[PDB]
Design a binder for this molecule. Sequence first.
Ligand SMILES: Nc1nc2c(ncn2[C@@H]2O[C@@H]3COP(=O)(O)O[C@H]4[C@@H](O)[C@H](n5cnc6c(=O)[nH]c(N)nc65)O[C@@H]4COP(=O)(O)O[C@H]3[C@H]2O)c(=O)[nH]1
Ligand code: IRI
Ligand code: IRI
Ligand code: IRI
Ligand code: IRI
Ligand code: IRI
Ligand code: IRI
Ligand code: IRI
Ligand code: IRI
Ligand code: IRI
Ligand SMILES: [Mg+2]
Ligand SMILES: [Mg+2]
Length: 90
Amino acid sequence: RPNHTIYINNLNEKIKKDELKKSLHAIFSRFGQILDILVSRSLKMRGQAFVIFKEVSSATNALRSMQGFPFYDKPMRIQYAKTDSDIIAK
RNA sequence: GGUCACGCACAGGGCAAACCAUUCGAAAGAGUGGGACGCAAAGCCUCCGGCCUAAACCAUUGCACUCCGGUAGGUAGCGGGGUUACCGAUG
Ligand SMILES: Nc1nc2c(ncn2[C@@H]2O[C@@H]3COP(=O)(O)O[C@H]4[C@@H](O)[C@H](n5cnc6c(=O)[nH]c(N)nc65)O[C@@H]4COP(=O)(O)O[C@H]3[C@H]2O)c(=O)[nH]1
Ligand code: IRI
Ligand code: IRI
Ligand code: IRI
Ligand code: IRI
Ligand code: IRI
Ligand code: IRI
Ligand code: IRI
Ligand code: IRI
Ligand code: IRI
Ligand SMILES: [Mg+2]
Ligand SMILES: [Mg+2]
């Protein structure tokens, strides 16, 4: 399970890629280095975001630390990415 | 001449990108004035394919790294298609 990337969803869809990123990057950059933050608003990539960390140990903290954390009046469903990210993969 | 194409010009003209000002819009963007990058339809029309925005509404709890919900708007200076038109070495 543990992975460089954490998988978030139940994300307020009203938020925009730009700001969603900034804010996610704000909150989560507290736990380590973010190689990147992937947010798309397409039909089925929406309400979710991937947060890729430098250290796999950063992700675990994130997960553990901020589960269900209230974010834009919603709670965060956090969990690991079944797979890695092309950065971490390649 | 008229027609259907064509654009090496001829000749008389037309439009106006970026950017600025100001107005409208949530945004894309559009209006108007200034201003020209270009344009032989850069006149006009969303039927077809792209791309852009996506406040509201409706659906979607959804695992991606090409990108893509419905609806709505935009782009005709992205194409194609329709349609109107000036000049005639041209065919
Ligand atoms: N009247 C007429 N003349 C034609 C036509 N096709 C070609 N020509 C002549 O041939 C020249 C070359 O045209 P171009 O390569 O398409 O290049 C043209 C074109 O791209 C542009 N342009 C000029 N007027 C117009 C216009 O009314 N509409 C559009 N869309 N573009 C224009 O400027 C360029 C040079 O302009 P010109 O000094 O007139 O120079 C033009 C013009 O003299 C046509 O359908 N009608
Ligand atoms: N000269 Ir004239 N103006 N440029 N006619 N060719 N279009
Ligand atoms: N004024 Ir206004 N143009 N800037 N409407 N807010 N968008
Ligand atoms: N003539 Ir025209 N080249 N400008 N429209 N086809 N794109
Ligand atoms: N055809 Ir349309 N849908 N109208 N692509 N141009 N946007
Ligand atoms: N193409 Ir419409 N017409 N469908 N613009 N997107 N709304
Ligand atoms: N006219 Ir038209 N050239 N712009 N639509 N065909 N693409
Ligand atoms: N100006 Ir315009 N570049 N934005 N042509 N409309 N596409
Ligand atoms: N005019 Ir027309 N540009 N040639 N639209 N038909 N494609
Ligand atoms: N009319 Ir005649 N056909 N003869 N256009 N000038 N070439
Ligand atoms: Mg030519
Ligand atoms: Mg023009």
